[PDB]
Amino acid sequence: HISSQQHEKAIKSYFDEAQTQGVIIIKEGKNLSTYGNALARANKEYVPASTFKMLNALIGLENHKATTNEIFKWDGKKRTYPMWEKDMTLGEAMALSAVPVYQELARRTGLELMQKEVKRVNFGNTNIGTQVDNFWLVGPLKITPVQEVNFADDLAHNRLPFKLETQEEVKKMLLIKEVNGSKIYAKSGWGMGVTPQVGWLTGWVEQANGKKIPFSLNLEMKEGMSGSIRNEITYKSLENLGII
């Protein structure tokens, strides 16, 4: 009974109230629906930032650069965040979004193999340049929100060019929330090394019946903004549309 006009107004209001500019793209089957307060962001390129952890993990696991139980030791050097000053698996580093572990994984893969794999999966603009440890954080690698929701759709359905086991292993690392009978799998991103700063939340909802609904939220992260606003806008948008 709720009008399209009302759903669009409600979702736009979530971005407006957060005093930011953003989009949330939802995919139902092959149909992409764009919502939010800055719809033109849908086909614009931004650094993937920490959302690249999903592809970094797939590449690393497929090419035997790590195992899912392997403990990446903390080197003992000071980190930006105290929770990163510990030993962790790829899964733990995914949940904590610990950059040093994923920079170690990128270094193990190496520039030549990383570029070949990024080109093979056809991720975003597919350019990683000459620095294997920061290309997803400060460029040249860029991707659009439409490309991110299509990547999430491919991963959710095991359509990426990796072993089924590799995709299942990475998907297990991405469970962030359980609402009723729905499971939310996603990875956030915050491009802190670029101006303006981009904020992402890309993933999918696995409904009780087995249906997978991919999504990609993309917005501008502003001064003193909490990371949780990406999760709050996403959950409110998915709940408004009856996805959760």
Ligand SMILES: *C(=O)N1C[C@H](NOS(=O)(=O)O)C(C)=C[C@H]1C(N)=O
């Ligand atoms: C990812 O974009 N990162 C790593 C880390 N986690 O942020 S996230 O939860 O939004 O992924 C962070 C604090 C910032 C950011 C970065 N550019 O290093």
Ligand SMILES: CC1=C[C@@H](C(N)=O)N2C[C@@H]1N(OS(=O)(=O)O)C2=O
């Ligand atoms: C809020 C945090 C979330 C998380 C992330 N998603 O990047 N990071 C950074 C900070 N945090 O915990 S801290 O060590 O207590 O700051 C940590 O593990």
